[PDB]
Amino acid sequence: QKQYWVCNSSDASISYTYCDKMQYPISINVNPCIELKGSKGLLHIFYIPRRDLKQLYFNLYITVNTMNLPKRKEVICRGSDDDYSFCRALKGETVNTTISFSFKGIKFSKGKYKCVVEAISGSPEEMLFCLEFVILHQPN
Amino acid sequence: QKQYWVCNSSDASISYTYCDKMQYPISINVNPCIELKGSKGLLHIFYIPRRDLKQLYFNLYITVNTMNLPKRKEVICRGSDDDYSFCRALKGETVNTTISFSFKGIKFSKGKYKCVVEAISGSPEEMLFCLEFVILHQPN
Amino acid sequence: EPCVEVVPNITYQCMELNFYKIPDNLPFSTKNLDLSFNPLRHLGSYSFFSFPELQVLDLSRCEIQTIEDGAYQSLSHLSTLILTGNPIQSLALGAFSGLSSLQKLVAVETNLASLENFPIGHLKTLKELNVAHNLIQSFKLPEYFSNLTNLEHLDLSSNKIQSIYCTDLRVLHQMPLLNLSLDLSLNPMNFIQPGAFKEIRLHKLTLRNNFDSLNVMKTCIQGLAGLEVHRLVLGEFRNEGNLEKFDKSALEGLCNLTIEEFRLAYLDYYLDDIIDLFNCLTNVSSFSLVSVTIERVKDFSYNFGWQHLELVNCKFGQFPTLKLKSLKRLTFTSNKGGNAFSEVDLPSLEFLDLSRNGLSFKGCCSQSDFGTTSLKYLDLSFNGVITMSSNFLGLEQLEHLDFQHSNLKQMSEFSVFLSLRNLIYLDISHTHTRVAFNGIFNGLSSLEVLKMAGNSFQENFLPDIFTELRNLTFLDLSQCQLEQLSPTAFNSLSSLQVLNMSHNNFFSLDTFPYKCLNSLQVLDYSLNHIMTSKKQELQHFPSSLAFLNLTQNDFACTCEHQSFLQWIKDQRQLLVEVERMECATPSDKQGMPVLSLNITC
Amino acid sequence: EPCVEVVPNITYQCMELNFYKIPDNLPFSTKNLDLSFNPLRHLGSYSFFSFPELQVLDLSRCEIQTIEDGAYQSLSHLSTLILTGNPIQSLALGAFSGLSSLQKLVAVETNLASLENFPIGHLKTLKELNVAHNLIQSFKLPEYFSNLTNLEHLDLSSNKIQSIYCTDLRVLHQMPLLNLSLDLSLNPMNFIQPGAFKEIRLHKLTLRNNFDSLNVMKTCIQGLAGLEVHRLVLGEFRNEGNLEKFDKSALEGLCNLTIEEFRLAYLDYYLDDIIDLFNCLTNVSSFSLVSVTIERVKDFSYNFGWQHLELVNCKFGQFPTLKLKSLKRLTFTSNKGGNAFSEVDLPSLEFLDLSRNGLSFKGCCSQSDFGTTSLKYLDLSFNGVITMSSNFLGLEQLEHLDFQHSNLKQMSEFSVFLSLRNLIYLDISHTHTRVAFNGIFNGLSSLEVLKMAGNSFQENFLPDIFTELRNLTFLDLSQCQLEQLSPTAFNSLSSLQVLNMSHNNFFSLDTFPYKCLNSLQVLDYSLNHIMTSKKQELQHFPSSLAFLNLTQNDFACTCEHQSFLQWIKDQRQLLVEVERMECATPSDKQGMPVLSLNITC
Ligand SMILES: *[C@@H]1O[C@H](CO)[C@@H](O[C@@H]2O[C@H](CO)[C@@H](O[C@@H]3O[C@H](CO)[C@@H](O)[C@H](O)[C@@H]3O)[C@H](O)[C@H]2NC(C)=O)[C@H](O)[C@H]1NC(C)=O
Ligand SMILES: *[C@@H]1O[C@H](CO)[C@@H](O[C@@H]2O[C@H](CO)[C@@H](O[C@@H]3O[C@H](CO)[C@@H](O)[C@H](O)[C@@H]3O)[C@H](O)[C@H]2NC(C)=O)[C@H](O)[C@H]1NC(C)=O
Ligand SMILES: *[C@@H]1O[C@H](CO)[C@@H](O[C@@H]2O[C@H](CO)[C@@H](O[C@@H]3O[C@H](CO)[C@@H](O)[C@H](O)[C@@H]3O)[C@H](O)[C@H]2NC(C)=O)[C@H](O)[C@H]1NC(C)=O
Ligand SMILES: *[C@@H]1O[C@H](CO)[C@@H](O[C@@H]2O[C@H](CO)[C@@H](O[C@@H]3O[C@H](CO)[C@@H](O)[C@H](O)[C@@H]3O)[C@H](O)[C@H]2NC(C)=O)[C@H](O)[C@H]1NC(C)=O
Ligand SMILES: *[C@@H]1O[C@H](CO)[C@@H](O[C@@H]2O[C@H](CO)[C@@H](O)[C@H](O)[C@H]2NC(C)=O)[C@H](O)[C@H]1NC(C)=O
Ligand SMILES: *[C@@H]1O[C@H](CO)[C@@H](O[C@@H]2O[C@H](CO)[C@@H](O)[C@H](O)[C@H]2NC(C)=O)[C@H](O)[C@H]1NC(C)=O
Ligand SMILES: *[C@@H]1O[C@H](CO)[C@@H](O)[C@H](O)[C@H]1NC(C)=O
Ligand SMILES: *[C@@H]1O[C@H](CO)[C@@H](O)[C@H](O)[C@H]1NC(C)=O
Ligand SMILES: *[C@@H]1O[C@H](CO)[C@@H](O)[C@H](O)[C@H]1NC(C)=O
Ligand SMILES: *[C@@H]1O[C@H](CO)[C@@H](O)[C@H](O)[C@H]1NC(C)=O
Ligand SMILES: *[C@@H]1O[C@H](CO)[C@@H](O)[C@H](O)[C@H]1NC(C)=O
Ligand SMILES: *[C@@H]1O[C@H](CO)[C@@H](O)[C@H](O)[C@H]1NC(C)=O
Numbered sequence A, B: 001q002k003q004y005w006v007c008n009s010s011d012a013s014i015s016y017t018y019c020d021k022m023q024y025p026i027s028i029n030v031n032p033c034i035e036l037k038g039s040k041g042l043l044h045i046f047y048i049p050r051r052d053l054k055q056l057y058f059n060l061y062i063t064v065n066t067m068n069l070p071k072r073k074e075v076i077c078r079g080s081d082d083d084y085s086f087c088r089a090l091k092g093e094t095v096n097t098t099i100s101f102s103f104k105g106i107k108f109s110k111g112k113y114k115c116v117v118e119a120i121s122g123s124p125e126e127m128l129f130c131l132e133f134v135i136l137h138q139p140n
Numbered sequence C, D: 001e002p003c004v005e006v007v008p009n010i011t012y013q014c015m016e017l018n019f020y021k022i023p024d025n026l027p028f029s030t031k032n033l034d035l036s037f038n039p040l041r042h043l044g045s046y047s048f049f050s051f052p053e054l055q056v057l058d059l060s061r062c063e064i065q066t067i068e069d070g071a072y073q074s075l076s077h078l079s080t081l082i083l084t085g086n087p088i089q090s091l092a093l094g095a096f097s098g099l100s101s102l103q104k105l106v107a108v109e110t111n112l113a114s115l116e117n118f119p120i121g122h123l124k125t126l127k128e129l130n131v132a133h134n135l136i137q138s139f140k141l142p143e144y145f146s147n148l149t150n151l152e153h154l155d156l157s158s159n160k161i162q163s164i165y166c167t168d169l170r171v172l173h174q175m176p177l178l179n180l181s182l183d184l185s186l187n188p189m190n191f192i193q194p195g196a197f198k199e200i201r202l203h204k205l206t207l208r209n210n211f212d213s214l215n216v217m218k219t220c221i222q223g224l225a226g227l228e229v230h231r232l233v234l235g236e237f238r239n240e241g242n243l244e245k246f247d248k249s250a251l252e253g254l255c256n257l258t259i260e261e262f263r264l265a266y267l268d269y270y271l272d273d274i275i276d277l278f279n280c281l282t283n284v285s286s287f288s289l290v291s292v293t294i295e296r297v298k299d300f301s302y303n304f305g306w307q308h309l310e311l312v313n314c315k316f317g318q319f320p321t322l323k324l325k326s327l328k329r330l331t332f333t334s335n336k337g338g339n340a341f342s343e344v345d346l347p348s349l350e351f352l353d354l355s356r357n358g359l360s361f362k363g364c365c366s367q368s369d370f371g372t373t374s375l376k377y378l379d380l381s382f383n384g385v386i387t388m389s390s391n392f393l394g395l396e397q398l399e400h401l402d403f404q405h406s407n408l409k410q411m412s413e414f415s416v417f418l419s420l421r422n423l424i425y426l427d428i429s430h431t432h433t434r435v436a437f438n439g440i441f442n443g444l445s446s447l448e449v450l451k452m453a454g455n456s457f458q459e460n461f462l463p464d465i466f467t468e469l470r471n472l473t474f475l476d477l478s479q480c481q482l483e484q485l486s487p488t489a490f491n492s493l494s495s496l497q498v499l500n501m502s503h504n505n506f507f508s509l510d511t512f513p514y515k516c517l518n519s520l521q522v523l524d525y526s527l528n529h530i531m532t533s534k535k536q537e538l539q540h541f542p543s544s545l546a547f548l549n550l551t552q553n554d555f556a557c558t559c560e561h562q563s564f565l566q567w568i569k570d571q572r573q574l575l576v577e578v579e580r581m582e583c584a585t586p587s588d589k590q591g592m593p594v595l596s597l598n599i600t601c
Helices: C214-223 C562-569 D216-223 D562-569
Strands: A015-018 A027-029 A037-045 A057-064 A073-077 A096-104 A114-121 A126-134 B015-018 B027-031 B041-047 B057-064 B074-077 B096-102 B114-119 B126-136 C005-009 C012-013 C033-034 C078-084 C104-106 C129-130 C154-155 C180-185 C204-208 C229-235 C263-266 C288-289 C308-312 C329-333 C351-353 C377-379 C400-404 C425-427 C449-451 C474-476 C498-500 C522-524 C546-548 D004-007 D011-013 D029-034 D080-082 D104-106 D128-130 D154-157 D181-185 D202-207 D231-235 D261-265 D287-289 D308-312 D329-333 D349-352 D378-379 D400-402 D424-429 D447-450 D475-477 D499-502 D522-524 D548-551
Touching: none
Parallel strands: C012 C033, C078 C104, C104 C129, C129 C154, C154 C180, C180 C204, C204 C229, C229 C263, C263 C288, C288 C308, C308 C329, C329 C351, C351 C377, C377 C400, C400 C425, C425 C449, C449 C474, C474 C498, C498 C522, C522 C546, D011 D029, D080 D104, D104 D128, D128 D154, D154 D181, D181 D202, D202 D231, D231 D261, D261 D287, D287 D308, D308 D329, D329 D349, D349 D378, D378 D400, D400 D424, D424 D447, D447 D475, D475 D499, D499 D522, D522 D548
Antiparallel strands: A015 A126, A027 A037, A037 A096, A057 A073, A057 A114, A114 A126, B015 B126, B027 B041, B041 B096, B057 B074, B057 B114, B114 B126, C005 C012, D004 D011
């Protein structure tokens, strides 16, 4: 498997690889790099979906240095008149977008956090891609 | 056992008798009589306790025409600097008082509601009296 | 067989298979062929001849430079084309020649430049035309649109449309019967000369994120006058740049139009008062807000004529105080900010839904909390903490009631559902309830569905609480940590068909309680630990019983209670998945299905 | 033996037994004789001679008209008299003659008229004197009070005291060392001439419900000037008539006094703003409100010097916003009105208690919610809904934490107690928690007591979550519906002494998990259904085990697993109440104690 690097901060080393048989390319950037201490920034994405990005959502499987957390379900855009403009896209339509984010207020232990991301969308609710992220964390 | 009548309203027939071996007299009045539909009135009490009315409370055992409800615990006056003046009384000290009450907002079925009242007080937490009330209810 | 085969001889999809021509080995009679992400640099005359019968075609990202005249010729019954992402620099006039029944045409991300040099002018029965993300400078409808009827959707979003002129839409005046849902989103526009829209009729109109300031938006809304749109949608997107300002002067002049349904989607400015805004959006029959942060607003009370109101995903500071004389339906779901509830006054309200807000009640339910007297539907599920202090007084016409996953309190202190004499559906599941009063379900004489899963009982004993529920057909008592039943509990339940008793802690299987249930069809005893019985009295079940789930629970396959296993193998016409019932206690006999074992003794 | 006998030869109580004289059959050496509600119309000289040694005497409602001189003569060691309810119309001078050590004298409901013709003037070592509900018109202390030292309480409530004069309390000036807790409640008073209290020192003073208007109260408070009371209590009673009015002008002039602790108990007027009231009650070191309805108050933020604040049983509209620079302890318990929580700013706070209010949190716990950084104690039990969105950040010095019977949320989504490295006590019981993350108890390296009863686990399996809790001595896992243990779960718990595992659903008793717990003393497996074991491997328990409760659960006394019952009867030096362990499964062998049965086979 090939390793795709993203960014380094003072206390993080985000990276990712592909989950399943499908290996459709994707371009992800974050500016500035995420500090696992409370951060704020922009997330730029360039993609060409293989299904309609309609009622897209994410399944998140997180692991904290070999302890599993429960499965998370994040609904990105819902039904009709959604917050984001990119989720009216169709197959083969280029998506080229930027989303702002911010967070703070939780202490994390040192270790090797890992996250499997499963995107689900479409009318028959099939999967779009699966990525596996790896985050190393050494405070200071 | 002797039956002590209290008052009649348009839809209630309150009455009471004594529970246990102790049969210390007590004078209870309500004006106007309680309507089991939402009411408001005054409760006049004349009594001579056999123990100190200190940190008094009530245990209530209610029965709705042969179905028991859970036991209720009503704290009348608590610790120090209590709301009522009568619960600084001592044994043999006359209590002669009036308390206002009001309620509304619950539908009751016809039947033969029954309530056993156990007063507990004192420093070693012993019982003061026990009365058994009977309420007949026929709406309209 | 390169192409994947989805449905036998009908649907054949094969994407990303590095093709260079239409495949030939596919059946002669197939429909809805998916063929995308395959390099086909050029499309030729009579390309699809192996498929005389066909419904759906799809050519996405199949990088096509030129479609020549006569393609798709031998192809009718084709109701859909998807030409998304194909860079087309020369579309030969006369293409799309033979398509007698074409309804949908998707040409997105094609390098379109205008609509008069677009060969769809002989088409008909065409309903939807999506040309979005193209390069279109002028919103002038060409003449052939008159010939083109049945058109219902026309999406031209994310184009380069800068201005509108009165000469545009000079066509569309000679259309007596015309339903057109238009969409112009993310078009950077700064000039709409007055009188453009006039005697025009649309069925929907969406204008999201195409105004760069407040004055631009004001003048553009002024440019609309006499438009008569049935449903108007304004707003913007969280993904892009937003309005720095939104005050009472904005959205004015929207009173020269004729609107019937309005929606505002995703403001980013912290709106501070609702009236003197939305001022001439009265007499609109349907009002809706989605993702608007009106959290510092004091005067919500005002008399609008709104027959339907919806607030979804908004942030608030306090619960809005509503006073609306004619509002039949209210939907207040998934909101975030404030967590409490206060009295509202809705004299004509029939449908209420406050779900997933997480807000608290105190003295929940009475006709003095909602102000109405004819409320047929009520949903309070997934909220924070509901305190019962009044059985539903003045709400005697209420057929649907849902509480699941809230936190009910004081539910065993009186007869809580005592007034609800016309109630069909009741759901109290995973409310932290502890049933300790026989008579909790008093007055529910019309109930048919009763769900309560996840609610314990006093000392884990099921008392006689299902009396007077004689219409009950569905009863769900699962994950209530039950250990004993009263021998006469399901009496009078002559109409029960499904009875769920799964995942409790039972040991003995008794057939006496169900002796007289003439309509039972499903009986579920699944995740228990049923090892034995009280005796060998286990008689026949009621003849109606057609399914008996007993899988997944612990059995003991030893000499003792061999008669129990004999009696269960005595009936295989009722068990469900005999593969999943096995032994567990004797470590030598483990994982062995119960019906298979022949044991001595 | 008419008189009931409480403690052998020590305490003899006999009330309502229709006596007419002191009983003679009682032992010669008895103490604390209770003798009340018995008709003794007259008390005579040397009445109590059979009791040379005696501590407590009680004559309540024993209707006594005259006590003659010389009674109680042969009676020392008597530290208490209770003459309540006796109508005394002639108390002979010289009564109470011989009582060398008398401390308490209760003369309530006696028909007293004044304090100079009261024969307690030779008494000494007398601490408390209660003369309440009498008929006393004048608050003039007699001279003999100078001779009477050690007096600490003087309750004269419910008397007819109308006015105070400067000549009153001319005594009490020649008392260098004097602690006197005075009480004047329900005395209808309308005149306190100025200068009465001056150079006077009290240790407590209670004035509840003795002012009929606002101006009367104002002038009376003016009559107090230079009083120097250590603790002042004002207010009124719900039982009587109340003040029609309470504004900022009231309670003024209370600034000429020297108060150190203040309490206001039970206002009936809906107070509307706290400052410009309580204005010159600053620099008071302790402030308290009980049963005051300050529900419409906006500006709670102001800089008082209050080192201790208490709000009990009050009604509020919003959570009061506190900004107090020096407030070490806060108690906010049992309040009623408003249900939410907002940030406070208490830079010097060490004790916090918000229990039984029923209020909700959102993002509960961080040093930005309380503004402090040295908080040793925190109690949030019996509240509504607490949402975890921050592990306790900035609260690293916190030794006590209680959550029981609240409703926690999001507790298995990260390490919630990750910062609390100095924590001794943790109580999360009957919070609706579903443990589904190994690592929920990460960071609690100093924990010694852990209580969690009533919290389920994922699929009812106990995982290895008690690692790093190496100081744990008390562990409570009861009514968690557990069915299986991991074979290595209580490892590293070398200091555990009590282990509660009562009222789960177990079937087998395994002794392997507890193989190495060298300090275990109590093991509780009570309300389970333990019938068998996994094998006959059950070895010795750790030698320290001195108690093993196994009562109340179902046993099966048949041929099969007879070895199990043999191994349990193999150890009677550890069982608890062998009377309560019996058989249940074979209906012939029912209610028979397990250790008693001798069965064949
Ligand atoms: C009685 O109530 C129980 C609720 O406890 C119902 O159980 C649910 O039954 C379905 C059907 O077996 C379960 O779904 C299964 O899920 C697994 C895992 O996702 C999947 O692999 C299976 O193929 C199947 O879809 C479900 O987990 C189970 N529990 C819940 C909470 O839904 C039961 O169906 C009810 N019985 C009747 C007769 O209605
Ligand atoms: C054996 O136990 C299983 C569960 O342990 C019982 O499950 C069957 O459960 C499924 C899921 O609840 C039922 O499914 C259908 O589910 C959809 C979900 O949206 C619902 O909308 C449909 O109305 C429908 O209920 C399924 O109906 C149910 N089986 C039957 C026969 O109703 C199972 O019932 C037990 N064995 C037997 C023979 O019932
Ligand atoms: C382990 O935790 C359980 C909690 O489930 C503790 O049980 C409690 O034990 C006491 C002592 O037997 C019970 O009190 C008894 O109450 C009855 C009825 O009031 C009374 O008749 C008895 O004389 C006795 O006082 C109590 O009900 C029971 N349950 C609860 C909820 O408190 C158990 O004590 C703990 N074990 C150890 C070793 O700490
Ligand atoms: C057998 O089971 C019973 C309960 O089923 C165990 O109970 C004993 O429980 C009582 C009540 O919890 C303990 O009581 C004392 O309770 C007061 C209540 O305020 C508490 O403040 C004291 O600190 C003390 O815990 C009692 O200590 C406890 N027994 C023992 C030995 O600690 C019982 O423990 C089980 N059998 C044995 C031999 O432990
Ligand atoms: C980003 O951070 C990662 C992790 O700290 C760096 O990777 C490691 O690089 C150091 C330095 O060469 C090695 O000693 C480690 O063995 C590496 N570990 C792993 C797991 O790769 C990485 O070099 C950083 N990237 C940049 C551009 O500085
Ligand atoms: C108060 O109400 C009770 C109950 O309605 C009355 O008691 C009953 O009196 C009627 C009339 O004489 C009898 O027919 C019933 O048999 C009585 N029932 C019981 C249980 O006593 C009572 O008379 C009323 N009191 C007054 C003063 O009117
Ligand atoms: C995405 O859009 C931005 C907006 O101008 C553009 O600069 C960028 O080049 C686009 N991405 C790609 C891959 O072209
Ligand atoms: C109780 O007090 C009131 C107040 O004046 C009085 O009228 C009444 O007589 C008293 N009760 C008795 C039994 O004297
Ligand atoms: C378009 O308008 C006509 C006019 O009645 C209506 O029948 C039709 O349903 C509308 N189209 C849609 C998609 O609703
Ligand atoms: C349901 O209950 C009502 C009221 O008890 C009764 O009239 C009706 O016959 C029952 N059955 C049906 C199918 O409505
Ligand atoms: C009375 O005051 C003295 C003075 O120091 C004190 O020692 C004593 O404790 C006080 N009395 C009470 C009951 O606290
Ligand atoms: C408790 O834990 C602390 C920190 O791990 C440790 O220093 C101490 O020795 C332990 N035991 C006691 C009795 O404090």
